[PDB]
RNA sequence: CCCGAUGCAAACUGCGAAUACCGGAGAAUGUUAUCACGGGAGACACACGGCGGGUGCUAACGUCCGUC
RNA sequence: CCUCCUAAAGAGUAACGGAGGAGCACGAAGGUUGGCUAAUCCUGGUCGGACAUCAGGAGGUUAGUGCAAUGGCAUAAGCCAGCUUGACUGCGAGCGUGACGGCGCGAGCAGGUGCGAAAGCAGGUCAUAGUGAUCCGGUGGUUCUGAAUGGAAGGGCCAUCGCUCAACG
RNA sequence: UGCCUGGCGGCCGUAGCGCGGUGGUCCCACCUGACCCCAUGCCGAACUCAGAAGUGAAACGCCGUAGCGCCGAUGGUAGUGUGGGGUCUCCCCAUGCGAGAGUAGGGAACUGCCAGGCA
């Protein structure tokens, strides 16, 4: 509970004062983070997919899980059941550690960082975005870079609507839009 | 030609191990003392009186043989 | 949904064993308590049951549902069935896993005089 | 590409019987008119008309199906 | 040979009709036990233009179910996984099909097995086409028999193989 | 015997969709931790283990709401068996059976056993 206890101590009180809920846990809470990767150009060979899987495993505390293509299409030249990428689901302490380390250091160290797109929601109160050039994280050593790729981080929130999602995002001070 | 359809109906006496209905699909399901072959040909596992019922949330049709 | 998933998983085995038209034993696992029941082939009557909800079993149990409570429920249901004479009813694990306390209660019932 | 309305489909039916088939009970009548076996047969190019149809150019006094 | 209508609500039912599909294949694509459930649309984003993975919602089987098609599949008959080969041996009441040989289903019995804690299931494939009666030939086993006797040849029985006879009871 | 909550069945949309109110007495649910029973084709996602720390937020329970789904008479209509007729390509007459759709009406279901709290 590196940040769970601190989160409950700090964010809950401010949000309750903001909304004045009748229950302590009515505040939206983070459940998990989906760490997908939309390379879209791993069809050439499996070496790139293996490298991306290794990078994701190094980033997190657990091995990633590969996923297959939902459908086969001709425009994109995709067969059925073709593995195109891998994802990671974090629940417990690893997710808290990942969130704290990305918010603390990762967010400021972005070139031309115009800020997170508030309107870029899922339409119900959850946020999902891809910060490209994942080299920002120190875990990805500069000497150990093969090709430029992008991340797909989705925050799972219990927000009833978009307003609660905005409130939860601002609870982390929302550096700027 | 292939003989399909129903050959035993409600209230019709049937002996043990007698075909009740043939069907390419499964328009009926075994009820009580009713079997089901590989070809979905319903048959009775014991002597009795045939009967058709409508049951299930989806309004399915079942064939059941009441014991004599 | 969780409840929908559990009931849809259980109903398959329920109907499969009901096809024989024989007595069944159904045990429901709850984080607090444990429920047990024996159902006749008719399916609209109860013959024997015992759960931790009643105070008659919680005297020796610190918690409502646990290993000790599961064992006590097993003993209670076995004794009640034997005195009533269910005569080797079938067992259904409420479409749940026979991997937790379900195994413990099943073993307790078996050693208590259940032939299922 | 899709949606609302508007008509049809023998190879569509979220609905759907009169009629014909089978199963059970029943008063009445029918030279058992019902069924099994055995001996002995004839025929094995049918026509016309009604009914619901396919084909046919819904032209046919054309042709082909099942019932009478 | 098979799928819907024609074919007129039992079944069957003509025509040089409308549409056609097949001679396959699997030692897993089967059985067991466990877990799961989709086509499609919108919103956001690195290549993304209207259609790559992902997050959410709507949707609730309109996909998938190997075949061209029909009827079914949510308890899924579909998907993933632990084991295995019950695709075993001798049988099998009774039922349906037809003019007929014959063909299909088939509860249940005895022996031994696989799965599942057990209850229980397993005698091939979601069902409906994948076939070739007929004699002849290659191989191995079987004293069953052997034209007076001991043997041999020959005959008999068991298991496999040679097929657009596409014209294929 | 009266109210509330749970399991087991019938009924299979008169049981459904949506809206409002409402629930922590018991019970139920969310949930902390999981190094231990146990598991992730990664993830305590699901199963399982130790609880009332906190809550009824969410699911679900109950009442109302007929906006929305359904059935549904009565009558009429088309259709059809039987016998006849016409102007026989089609229709009518006497008689029997009688559609679909839609109208009135309904309901926010009902029902049997036990258990825990409230009485």
B60 touches strand E (CB under 7 A): yes
- Among C1, C31, C5, which Cα is nearest to C96's? C5
C65 touches strand F (CB under 7 A): yes
Show me where the domains of chain B are located.
4-68
Are B53 and B59 in contact by the 8 Å Cβ rule? The answer is no
- Considering all nucleic acid strands, name the nucleotide whose C1' atom is nearest to the C-alpha of residue B11: D23
- Among A32, A37, A35, which Cα is nearest to A156's? A32
The C-alpha atoms of residue A26 and residue A28 are separated, in whole angstroms, by: 6
The C-alpha atoms of residue A156 and residue A28 are separated, in whole angstroms, by: 10
CATH number of the domain within which A28 lies: 3.30.1440.10
A134: tokens are 């994942």
The C-alpha atoms of residue A67 and residue A82 are separated, in whole angstroms, by: 8
Contacts of C111 (CB under 8 A, 6+ apart): none
Strand ordering across the sheet containing C46-49: C24-29, C34-39, C46-49
Q: In total, how many domains does chain C have?
A: 1
Per DSSP, helices labelled H in chain C are 2-18, 67-84, 101-113
Are A10 and A173 in contact by the 8 Å Cβ rule? The answer is no
Chain breaks of chain B after residues with C–N above 2.5 Å: none
- Among C101, C105, C95, C114, which Cα is nearest to C50's? C105
C90 touches strand F (CB under 7 A): no
Are C40 and C31 in contact by the 8 Å Cβ rule? The answer is no
Are A99 and A41 in contact by the 8 Å Cβ rule? The answer is no
- Report DSSP state, residue A27: S
Count of CB atoms situated within 10 Å of the CB of A39: 16
C106: tokens are 């099943």
Helix, strand, coil abundance in chain A, percent, nearest 5 = 35, 20, 45
A122 touches strand E (CB under 7 A): yes
Are C80 and C48 in contact by the 8 Å Cβ rule? The answer is yes
Elucidated via: cryo-EM
Cα A65 versus chain centre, distance: 15
DSSP A51-65: HHHHHHHHHSSS--E
CA of A120 to C1' of D49 (A): 82
Which domain, by its residues, includes C106?
1-116
- Among B16, B27, B15, which Cα is nearest to B52's? B27
The angle at the Cα of B43, spanning B42 to B49, to the nearest 5 degrees, equals: 115
- Among A167, A130, A174, which Cα is nearest to A34's? A130
Q: How many helices (H) and strands (E) are present in chain B, helices listed first?
A: 0, 8
The C-alpha atoms of residue A151 and residue A146 are separated, in whole angstroms, by: 15
Ramachandran angles phi, psi of B42, nearest 5°: -70, 140
Rounded alpha-carbon distances, angstroms, from residue A168 to A27, A160, A171, C40:
8, 12, 5, 54
Are A12 and A27 in contact by the 8 Å Cβ rule? The answer is yes
C113: Cα within 13 Å, side-chain hemisphere = 13
Which domain, by its residues, includes A82?
3-172
Q: Which helix (H) or strand (E) holds A95?
A: helix A93-101
Instruction: Look at the alpha carbons of C56, C62, C65, C68 in this order and tell me if their dihedral is positive or negative.
Output: negative
Ramachandran angles phi, psi of C51, nearest 5°: -135, 155
The C-alpha atoms of residue B21 and residue B11 are separated, in whole angstroms, by: 14
The C-alpha atoms of residue A91 and residue C28 are separated, in whole angstroms, by: 28
Ramachandran angles phi, psi of C109, nearest 5°: -60, -45
Q: In total, how many domains does chain A have?
A: 1
Ramachandran angles phi, psi of A132, nearest 5°: -80, 165
Cited resolution, angstroms: 3.8
Q: How would you classify the pairing of strands A83-87 and B60-67?
A: unpaired
Length of chain C: 116
- Among A116, A155, A159, which Cα is nearest to A28's? A159
Furthest-apart CA pair in chain C: how many Å? 41
The C-alpha atoms of residue A84 and residue A87 are separated, in whole angstroms, by: 11
Q: Which bases of strand E have any atom within 7 Å of the beta carbon of a protein residue?
A: 2-4, 10-13, 34-40, 42-57, 70-77, 93-98, 104-107, 117-120, 124-128
Are A65 and A16 in contact by the 8 Å Cβ rule? The answer is no
- Among C5, C51, C30, C12, which Cα is nearest to C100's? C30
A86: tokens are 């891998």
A36 touches strand E (CB under 7 A): yes
Strand ordering across the sheet containing B13-14: B13-14, B48-55, B60-67, B29-30
B40: tokens are 């979905």
B6: tokens are 């129903």
The C-alpha atoms of residue A117 and residue A96 are separated, in whole angstroms, by: 22
The C-alpha atoms of residue A122 and residue A101 are separated, in whole angstroms, by: 24
- Among C99, C91, C89, C70, which Cα is nearest to C10's? C91
CA of B37 to C1' of D59 (A): 56
The C-alpha atoms of residue A101 and residue A136 are separated, in whole angstroms, by: 12
DSSP β-bridge partners for residue B44: B34
The C-alpha atoms of residue A37 and residue A148 are separated, in whole angstroms, by: 12
């Amino acid at each position: 509970a590196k940040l769970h206890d601190y989160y409950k101590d700090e964010v809950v009180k401010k949000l309750m004062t903001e909304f004045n809920y009748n229950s302590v846990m009515q505040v939206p809470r983070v459940e998990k983070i989906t760490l997908n990767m939309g390379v879209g150009e791993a069809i050439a060979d499996k070496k790139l997919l293996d490298n991306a899987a290794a990078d994701l495993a190094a980033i997190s505390g657990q091995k990633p899980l590969i996923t297959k293509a939902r459908k086969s299409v001709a425009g994109f030249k995709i067969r059925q059941g073709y593995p195109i990428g891998c994802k990671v689901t974090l629940r417990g302490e690893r997710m808290w550690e990942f969130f704290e380390r990305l918010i603390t250091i990762a967010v400021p160290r972005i070139r031309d960082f115009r800020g997170l797109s508030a309107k870029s929601f899922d339409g119900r109160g959850n946020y999902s975005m891809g910060v490209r050039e994942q080299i920002i994280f120190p875990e990805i050593d500069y000497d150990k870079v093969d090709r430029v790729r992008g991340l797909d981080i989705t925050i799972t929130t219990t927000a009833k609507s978009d307003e609660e999602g905005r409130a939860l995002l601002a609870a982390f001070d929302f550096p700027f839009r | 030609a292939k003989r399909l359809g129903v050959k035993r109906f409600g209230g019709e006496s049937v002996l043990a191990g007698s075909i009740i209905v043939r069907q390419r699909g499964t328009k009926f399901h075994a009820g009580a003392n009713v079997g089901c072959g590989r070809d979905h040909t319903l048959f009775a596992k014991a002597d009795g009186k045939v009967k058709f019922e409508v049951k299930g949330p989806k309004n399915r049709k079942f064939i059941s043989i009441e014991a004599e | 949904d969780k409840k929908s998933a559990r009931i849809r998983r259980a109903t398959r085995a329920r109907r499969k064993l009901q096809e024989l038209g024989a007595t069944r034993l159904v045990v429901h696992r709850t984080p607090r308590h444990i429920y047990a029941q024996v159902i006749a082939p008719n399916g609209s009557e109860v013959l024997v049951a015992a759960s931790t909800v009643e105070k008659a079993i919680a005297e020796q149990l610190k918690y409502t549902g646990n290993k000790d409570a599961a064992a006590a429920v097993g003993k209670a249901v076995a004794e009640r069935a034997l005195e009533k004479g269910i005569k080797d009813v079938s067992f259904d694990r409420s479409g749940f896993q026979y991997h937790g306390r379900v195994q413990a209660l099943a073993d307790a019932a078996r050693e208590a005089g259940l032939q299922f």
